[PDB]
Design a protein around this ligand. Sequence first.
Ligand SMILES: CCCn1cc(-c2nc(Nc3ccc(C(=O)NC)cc3)nc3[nH]ccc23)cn1
Length: 265
Amino acid sequence: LKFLQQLGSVEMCRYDPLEVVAVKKLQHSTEEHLRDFEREIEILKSLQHDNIVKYKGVCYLKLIMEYLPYGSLRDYLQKHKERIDHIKLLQYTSQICKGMEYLGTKRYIHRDLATRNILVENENRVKIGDFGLTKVLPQDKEYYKVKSPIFWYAPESLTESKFSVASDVWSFGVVLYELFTYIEKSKSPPAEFMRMIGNDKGQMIVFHLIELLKNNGRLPRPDGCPDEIYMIMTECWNNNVNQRPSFRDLALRVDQIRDNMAGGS
Ligand SMILES: CCCn1cc(-c2nc(Nc3ccc(C(=O)NC)cc3)nc3[nH]ccc23)cn1
């Protein structure tokens, strides 16, 4: 393994036993973080899906994965904005949904779904690309309690530190918002929420975000975003956990909308 460049810590290396892979290493190799990293490796090893970054092995502790040359979807969408139409955005949306559907069949909770964690293999394929916060659900519950990127958090994650497939669905709604704002920073969830809360404010931000969400304040419909797509976002952002859609139903709806858009309805 020959170091080439740092990517994210994550590095680009050459595994040439006399070949390009991504290598995740730990910054502060403590006992607590090593135990977490060990579980992250097992989680990624257990996942085989076209839209999940491919596990390749371990090094003595280093995590070896396939190298995805277009980097994160944020950098990619920013650089290629003008040539990424809505049908393409929904192609990525569908692939993220199906990755999350598959994650759900293992009873894994991702807990960090955001465009920053999606990587781009090529113009036609994106992959969920980091699993550093992912939890395996306990046998006795449908949620995991963990004591943060608050502007992607479901209300019950903010108030009770509870994470579930349903809170992943909320965060997917925010991902869909990020895509249809073309990840413009002035439109980003943090910028929008801070303007809605009022820039007259740390812990107080979380307080006012909770109050805002409880009063059904929401991120606005992005410019140019079709109503059917904004409707999916708002269904993901239901305060009632039981009312949020499943990833399987989201995948089917996104595919139908994409096909309708391409065919002229
Ligand atoms: C998502 C947060 C953690 N993280 C994961 C990675 C990662 N990156 C990449 N490729 C990559 C990255 C950046 C750039 C770039 O910026 N070029 C100007 C180009 C290619 N392949 C990966 N395979 C497995 C993980 C991983 C980086 N950070």
